[PDB]
Write a protein that binds this DNA or RNA. Structure first.
Ligand SMILES: [Mg+2]
Ligand SMILES: [Mg+2]
Ligand SMILES: [Mg+2]
Ligand SMILES: [Mg+2]
Ligand SMILES: [Mg+2]
Ligand SMILES: [Mg+2]
Ligand SMILES: [Mg+2]
Ligand SMILES: [Mg+2]
Ligand SMILES: [Mg+2]
Ligand SMILES: [Mg+2]
Ligand SMILES: [Mg+2]
Ligand SMILES: [Mg+2]
Ligand SMILES: [Mg+2]
Ligand SMILES: [Mg+2]
Ligand SMILES: [Mg+2]
Ligand SMILES: [Mg+2]
Ligand SMILES: [Mg+2]
Ligand SMILES: [Mg+2]
Ligand SMILES: [Mg+2]
Ligand SMILES: [Mg+2]
Ligand SMILES: [Mg+2]
Ligand SMILES: [Mg+2]
Ligand SMILES: [Mg+2]
Ligand SMILES: [Mg+2]
Ligand SMILES: [Mg+2]
Ligand SMILES: [Mg+2]
Ligand SMILES: [Mg+2]
Ligand SMILES: [Mg+2]
Ligand SMILES: [Mg+2]
Ligand SMILES: [Mg+2]
Ligand SMILES: [Mg+2]
Ligand SMILES: [Mg+2]
Ligand SMILES: [Mg+2]
Ligand SMILES: [Mg+2]
Ligand SMILES: [Mg+2]
Ligand SMILES: [Mg+2]
Ligand SMILES: [Mg+2]
Ligand SMILES: [Mg+2]
Ligand SMILES: [Mg+2]
Ligand SMILES: [Mg+2]
Ligand SMILES: [Mg+2]
Ligand SMILES: [Mg+2]
Ligand SMILES: [Mg+2]
Ligand SMILES: [Mg+2]
Ligand SMILES: [Mg+2]
Ligand SMILES: [Mg+2]
Ligand SMILES: [Mg+2]
Ligand SMILES: [Mg+2]
Ligand SMILES: [Mg+2]
Ligand SMILES: [Mg+2]
Ligand SMILES: [Mg+2]
Ligand SMILES: [Mg+2]
Ligand SMILES: [Mg+2]
Ligand SMILES: [Mg+2]
Ligand SMILES: [Mg+2]
Ligand SMILES: [Mg+2]
Ligand SMILES: [Mg+2]
Ligand SMILES: [Mg+2]
Ligand SMILES: [Mg+2]
Ligand SMILES: [Mg+2]
Ligand SMILES: [Mg+2]
Ligand SMILES: [Mg+2]
Ligand SMILES: [Mg+2]
Ligand SMILES: [Mg+2]
Ligand SMILES: [Mg+2]
Ligand SMILES: [Mg+2]
Ligand SMILES: [Mg+2]
Ligand SMILES: [Mg+2]
Ligand SMILES: [Mg+2]
Ligand SMILES: [Mg+2]
Ligand SMILES: [Mg+2]
Ligand SMILES: [Mg+2]
Ligand SMILES: [Mg+2]
Ligand SMILES: [Mg+2]
Ligand SMILES: [Mg+2]
Ligand SMILES: [Mg+2]
Ligand SMILES: [Mg+2]
Ligand SMILES: [Mg+2]
Ligand SMILES: [Mg+2]
Ligand SMILES: [Mg+2]
Ligand SMILES: [Mg+2]
Ligand SMILES: [Mg+2]
Ligand SMILES: [Mg+2]
Ligand SMILES: [Mg+2]
Ligand SMILES: [Mg+2]
Ligand SMILES: [Mg+2]
Ligand SMILES: [Mg+2]
Ligand SMILES: [Mg+2]
Ligand SMILES: [Mg+2]
Ligand SMILES: [Mg+2]
Ligand SMILES: [Mg+2]
Lengths: 217, 158, 62, 173
RNA sequence: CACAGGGAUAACUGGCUUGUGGCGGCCAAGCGUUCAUAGCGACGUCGCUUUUUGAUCCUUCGAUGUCGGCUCUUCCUAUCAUACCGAAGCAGAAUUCGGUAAGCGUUGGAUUGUUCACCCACUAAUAGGGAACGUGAGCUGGGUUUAGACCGUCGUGAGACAGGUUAGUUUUACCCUACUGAUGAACUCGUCGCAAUGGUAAUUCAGCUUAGUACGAGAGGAACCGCUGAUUCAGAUAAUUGGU
RNA sequence: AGGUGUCCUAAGGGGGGCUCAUGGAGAACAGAAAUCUCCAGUAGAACAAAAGGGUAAAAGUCCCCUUGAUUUUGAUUUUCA
RNA sequence: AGACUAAUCGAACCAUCUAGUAGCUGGUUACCGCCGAAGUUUCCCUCAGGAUAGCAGUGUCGACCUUCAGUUUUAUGAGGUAAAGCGAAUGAUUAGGGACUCGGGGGCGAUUUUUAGCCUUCAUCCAUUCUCAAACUUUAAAUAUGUAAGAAGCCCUUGUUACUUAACUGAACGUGGGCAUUCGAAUGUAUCGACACUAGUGGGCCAUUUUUGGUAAGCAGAACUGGCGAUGCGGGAUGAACCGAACGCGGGGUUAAGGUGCCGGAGUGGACGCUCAUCAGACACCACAAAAGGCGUUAGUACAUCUUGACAGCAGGACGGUGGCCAUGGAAGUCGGAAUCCGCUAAGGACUGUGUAACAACUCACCUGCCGAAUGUACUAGCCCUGAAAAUGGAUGGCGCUCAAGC
């Protein structure tokens, strides 16, 4: 099986997720989404790069794992197993059907032709839009060249057109590099597991002080 | 393919969010007379005297009054001609309509405003007119100096 | 063999060909469907009011 | 096309909560004042929350060149749309007026980059006051000291209706 | 077996589509003693073709003769051989990858109705396809597909079977055009010449010599010129030999 | 993606008291799970059946009395000429 | 042998009933004038056919009724699609952190263990985090949609009744009276209402936006509107459906879509650029081409170097401690193992190679002399080129065109 990817490139049907109405869908191909030192603190990795889509198309589950493996090998070899954190931010939830013309309607004739042509599940695919982020990598500042090359190498496994953008934020946080740096000096940022939480001055005064001791001087 | 009496009414007849429960009791204290203008709005909780899904949202005229229901006349559009329809609706579904209140307000106002002028002796120009184009005026720039704008260069957000 | 199932392509133009005719409203609507109890009494009421107004020439002078 | 510069001033319609709203002014290059107003509402819709239905135009004027008989260098900042993405450039021109540079720029971008009028935004036009602030090398050669050059191989002009000449022409005009 | 009709509806060509079939690219984890790219290429991904088979039912049911072989002409290149060259994990010899190139060739037999296939032998080589799946008023009629007859399984029976077996009529050109040849009115009848345009042709191998030389530890083992013959094809000829 | 050719003297009609699924903490045999007590608990339970809507001093649950599942004919709504 | 029974046999020949019936093929005879369709709804042993409603014509009557409307404006109702949401319910889903031990699993101090000891791996709970939903939702458009805009209106006074109220209190229908000086939004009214009888049609097809099954189709099935069928004319060379525009017989004037080097009516017309192809390119529907590449050329983004003078070439030099610590028939920078300082300077390394048994010699690195203004690396997108293979001879319509007659 495994028809060429040219046959399922355009979003032409309403979303068809697996539910209690369709049963027997095959298990998707990609499982792991986070690789590398996925528990480093926010202060360790201040540089982020993205792989941004530029078409309204469909990305197969098989292609997503192929790009994940390709980028992982290059990063591990040149940056070290502990020098990066890679995250895949596209999840396939759309199920594509197939009409087995000869398996179902061959040999023993049964009914042949286009009569009763509703198909059976065949795979899982992901829907993307223009400007949607596909793969993100965070690392040190001295690894800018390595990160760019790794992303540029893994786009040959995708159909369509993709771009590479160096983000202006700090790590995976939605804050500008300058803004996060000065806010942290004010004591309104507390450490968590690989992420942070922020002071919100809209609760009871008691535990806001212990959670953020440096906010009040 | 089926065609039942309530088919396709999953969202139409349902009560809203945080609005289930007790019916506000002022509904049963209203009064109706023949010739009034009422509009239909089906309440899901009451299952008796409920009209067909076509009339949910139409406006009609009362023509009969009984112990707990009113008769409404509405006009239905079959292909190429109109037909008069007469339905019986329980009062939990009907409601007085503000469609005609603007007219009834204006006739009372017109009669009194015309009366004073006839005693005084000046034309009124009572009937309404649509919006007219604006008139000439002057705008001063004292302490309101204009600020110059320009398009902004392209920049990447993410 | 097989043929077209259903259509509505030219129905709107056919209906508007010579107008969508709305029945004319008129001063005195019929009393069909009104509850009988009010209908019986209304009959007796009108019988009296005609006689009283007929006697207006040789009578009450209200 | 054939352009000329305007200034146009707009305003949000005054209301009881906000009498005397603010005033905004732009410089717009347009063939005529009918499309000069149209571009004002287009640029303003991307900066403030004002439409044409809820606004009004205060004044529109024509700005003319101060010294249309002096040669000077110009620099233009602009953005445009390609077939994929948007970009920023900065080009230079040499002429006598502000209006013609926008005319020259529109024809230049249409040829070298296939960019139409629909997808070009003009950011700023400034006249270069000095001579050492000229960047591009195709204008540096036009400001060299004691410029002079001949014109070799120039075809003479012959009436298009006079066929069958009687002798060979010459190209040493 | 019959009648009234249907290209509103199937079995063959042609048309749109290319899933399957066939053919060709891009990226580079790894194989190759060492070394991603001499020669290959996983996981993925972009195309071309209409000699496979499907899907569709637009044209023909007052009829377009429906398998295969024999015969004969021409065209396509995704090149089996031949001409001349570029690469190598190319010392020689033998091989493998690629370019310009369709000028010229691509066979004789055993079994099967076969297309397809499989062995014997020769050869420089025994490449793949199109033309209404070229070609029945060109042939042949072994196969399939009318009526006779036999067997096996199925059916109570008449009978059924893309299961096996044996026997079974193949019609017409003198018309128009096309092609191959042959005469010919008008400007007197003749002899001797020029050449616009159309056609075009040759092909491959072996022996002797170079030489048991270059090259190689050895085993092994070439080529250019020169000389003489032969295979397939083409145009003539009859002194001799053979046939009538 | 699924359903119907049935089932009910109450699973029909009226009235009255009560509050469900589940969770926390406790009590001889007693345990993950038997019965008893308190606190929290917007329906996450139940209502003959497919699915959707609706219901909390009820339309759920238990108790008390009953046969409007009766008689005579007309008007109206949905599929629709 | 379904064989033969007068050229006739799976039921002979001759006359009559008989002009046997046909929802199925074929044909159906002069001219001009005016109006002008349907392939859709419901039922039928109905699907090649009929009845029923619609669309169509003719004959009129009621008034010339001032009534009307595929429309806008103002006031007021209904809805659950596009988008949006998941640190909001139901369903799906990725990752760390904190809190807990008696939830399961594996250990440790004597596996002592009823040690809430010391370890920890899942599970659980709490505050955060990465992506989704035709048959999920707290929210919520655009386009379309119901009603109203008065004389049959508004207000005052008071008769009838077997209904209704404790009650002449209400309820419907009324007599009498009051309110125009202006009958109470725009625009149009080249078309008002009612009735009678009947023809053809009930195979449809194409396109923009929305949209379902299918790998896809000049394939199958739908919604609103415009077209062909039923229709010529001017442009797309040709072509039922595309663009312009709908038609009595003529004369003059002006244009639309499309065109102006020749065929061909009208420019080898004007301004600034880009492109050289041994397969150039040349106008919507439309008759095709992709990923990936180029130091061909043009324009652009960012960083770094430079008059204290770089980039290229040529030309000068290329020094000490020290043959460093180790290794050793022998290793002096250069088998190998492990460190990387200092002198002198403008610059020359406890050295990148070549090379010696081992030294040497030589190269590079680094700096200096000459010159005269720019130079280096990585990316973006225009035209062009590679990727680019089919069968009779051949088609931007043809000829031909290169500061075009190409974009
Ligand atoms: Mg394939
Ligand atoms: Mg679909
Ligand atoms: Mg429905
Ligand atoms: Mg509702
Ligand atoms: Mg009921
Ligand atoms: Mg039909
Ligand atoms: Mg029509
Ligand atoms: Mg057909
Ligand atoms: Mg294919
Ligand atoms: Mg290897
Ligand atoms: Mg290769
Ligand atoms: Mg592969
Ligand atoms: Mg085919
Ligand atoms: Mg066919
Ligand atoms: Mg036929
Ligand atoms: Mg024929
Ligand atoms: Mg024939
Ligand atoms: Mg043969
Ligand atoms: Mg070739
Ligand atoms: Mg070759
Ligand atoms: Mg040949
Ligand atoms: Mg033979
Ligand atoms: Mg073929
Ligand atoms: Mg054939
Ligand atoms: Mg024959
Ligand atoms: Mg044949
Ligand atoms: Mg023949
Ligand atoms: Mg035979
Ligand atoms: Mg037979
Ligand atoms: Mg016979
Ligand atoms: Mg038997
Ligand atoms: Mg047989
Ligand atoms: Mg036979
Ligand atoms: Mg015989
Ligand atoms: Mg003959
Ligand atoms: Mg030798
Ligand atoms: Mg030998
Ligand atoms: Mg040889
Ligand atoms: Mg011969
Ligand atoms: Mg002889
Ligand atoms: Mg079903
Ligand atoms: Mg009961
Ligand atoms: Mg009860
Ligand atoms: Mg109760
Ligand atoms: Mg519910
Ligand atoms: Mg229906
Ligand atoms: Mg027989
Ligand atoms: Mg006889
Ligand atoms: Mg006989
Ligand atoms: Mg007989
Ligand atoms: Mg007879
Ligand atoms: Mg007859
Ligand atoms: Mg007859
Ligand atoms: Mg006519
Ligand atoms: Mg007409
Ligand atoms: Mg049929
Ligand atoms: Mg027919
Ligand atoms: Mg008519
Ligand atoms: Mg919704
Ligand atoms: Mg809905
Ligand atoms: Mg959505
Ligand atoms: Mg929302
Ligand atoms: Mg959720
Ligand atoms: Mg959840
Ligand atoms: Mg956790
Ligand atoms: Mg929805
Ligand atoms: Mg409205
Ligand atoms: Mg029918
Ligand atoms: Mg009919
Ligand atoms: Mg048809
Ligand atoms: Mg018919
Ligand atoms: Mg067509
Ligand atoms: Mg169709
Ligand atoms: Mg069809
Ligand atoms: Mg027309
Ligand atoms: Mg024409
Ligand atoms: Mg054309
Ligand atoms: Mg022109
Ligand atoms: Mg001309
Ligand atoms: Mg010119
Ligand atoms: Mg060249
Ligand atoms: Mg380029
Ligand atoms: Mg440049
Ligand atoms: Mg130098
Ligand atoms: Mg090309
Ligand atoms: Mg040509
Ligand atoms: Mg061409
Ligand atoms: Mg042309
Ligand atoms: Mg020019
Ligand atoms: Mg031309
Ligand atoms: Mg031009």
């Amino acid at each position: 099986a495994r028809r060429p990817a040219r046959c399922y490139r355009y979003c032409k049907n309403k979303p068809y997720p697996k539910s209690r109405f369709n049963r027997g869908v095959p298990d998707p191909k990609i499982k792991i989404y986070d690789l590398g030192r996925k528990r480093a603190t926010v202060d360790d990795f201040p540089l982020c790069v993205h792989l941004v889509s530029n078409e309204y198309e469909q990305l197969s589950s098989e292609a997503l794992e192929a790009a994940r493996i390709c980028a992982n090998k290059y990063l591990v070899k040149y940056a070290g197993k502990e020098g990066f954190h890679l995250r895949v931010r596209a999840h396939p939830y759309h199920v594509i059907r197939i009409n087995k013309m000869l398996s179902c309607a061959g040999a023993d004739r049964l009914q042949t032709g286009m009569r009763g042509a509703f198909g059976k599940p065949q795979g899982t695919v992901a829907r993307v839009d223009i400007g949607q982020i596909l793969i993100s990598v965070r690392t040190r500042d001295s690894n800018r060249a390595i990160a760019l090359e790794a992303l540029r190498r893994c786009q040959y496994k995708f159909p369509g057109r993709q771009k590479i953008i160096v983000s202006k934020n700090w790590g995976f946080t939605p804050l500008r590099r300058e803004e996060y740096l000065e806010k942290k000096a004010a004591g309104r940022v507390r450490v968590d597991g690989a992420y942070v939480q922020f002071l919100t001055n809209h609760g009871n005064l008691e535990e806001n002080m212990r959670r953020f001791p440096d906010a009040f001087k | 393919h089926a065609a039942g009496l309530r088919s396709g009414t999953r969202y139409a007849f349902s009560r809203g969010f945080r609005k289930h429960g007790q019916i506000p009791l002022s509904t049963y204290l209203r009064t109706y007379r023949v010739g009034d203008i009422v509009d239909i709005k089906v309440n899901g909780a009451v299952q008796k005297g409920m009209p067909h899904k076509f009339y949910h949202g139409k406006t009609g005229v009362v023509y009969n009054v009984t112990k707990s229901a009113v008769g409404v006349i509405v006009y239905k559009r079959v292909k190429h001609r109109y037909i008069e329809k007469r339905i019986n609706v329980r009062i939990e579904h009907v409601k007085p309509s503000r469609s005609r209140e603007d007219f009834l307000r204006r006739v009372k106002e017109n009669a009194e405003l015309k009366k004073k002028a006839k005693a005084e002796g000046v034309p009124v120009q009572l009937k309404r007119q649509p919006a007219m184009p604006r008139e000439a005026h002057t705008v001063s720039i004292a302490d309101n100096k204009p600020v110059t704008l320009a398009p902004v260069a392209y920049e990447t957000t993410i | 063999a097989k043929s077209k199932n259903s259509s509505q392509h030219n129905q709107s133009r056919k209906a508007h060909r010579n107008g969508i005719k709305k029945p004319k409203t008129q001063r005195y609507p019929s009393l069909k469907g009104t509850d009988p109890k009010f209908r019986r009494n209304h009959r007796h009421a009108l019988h009296g009011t005609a006689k009283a107004l007929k006697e207006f020439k040789e009578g009450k002078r209200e | 096309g054939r352009l000329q510069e305007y200034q146009v001033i707009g305003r949000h319609l005054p209301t009881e909560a906000n009498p005397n709203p603010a005033l905004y002014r732009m410089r717009i290059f347009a063939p005529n004042e009918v499309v000069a107003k149209s571009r004002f509402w287009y640029f303003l819709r991307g900066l403030k929350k004002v439409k044409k239905a809820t606004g009004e135009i205060v004044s529109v004027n024509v700005i003319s060149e101060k010294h249309p008989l002096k040669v000077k260098n110009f620099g233009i900042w602009l953005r445009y749309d390609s077939r994929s993405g948007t970009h920023n450039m900065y080009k230079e021109y040499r002429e006598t007026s502000r209006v013609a540079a926008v005319e020259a720029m529109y024809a230049d971008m249409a040829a070298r980059h296939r960019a139409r009028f629909r997808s070009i935004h003009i950011l700023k036009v400034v006249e270069l006051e000095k001579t050492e602030d000229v960047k591009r090398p195709y204008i540096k050669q036009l400001v060299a000291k004691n410029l002079s050059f001949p014109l070799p191989h120039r075809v003479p002009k012959i009436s298009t209706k006079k066929i069958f000449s009687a002798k060979r022409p010459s190209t040493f005009s």
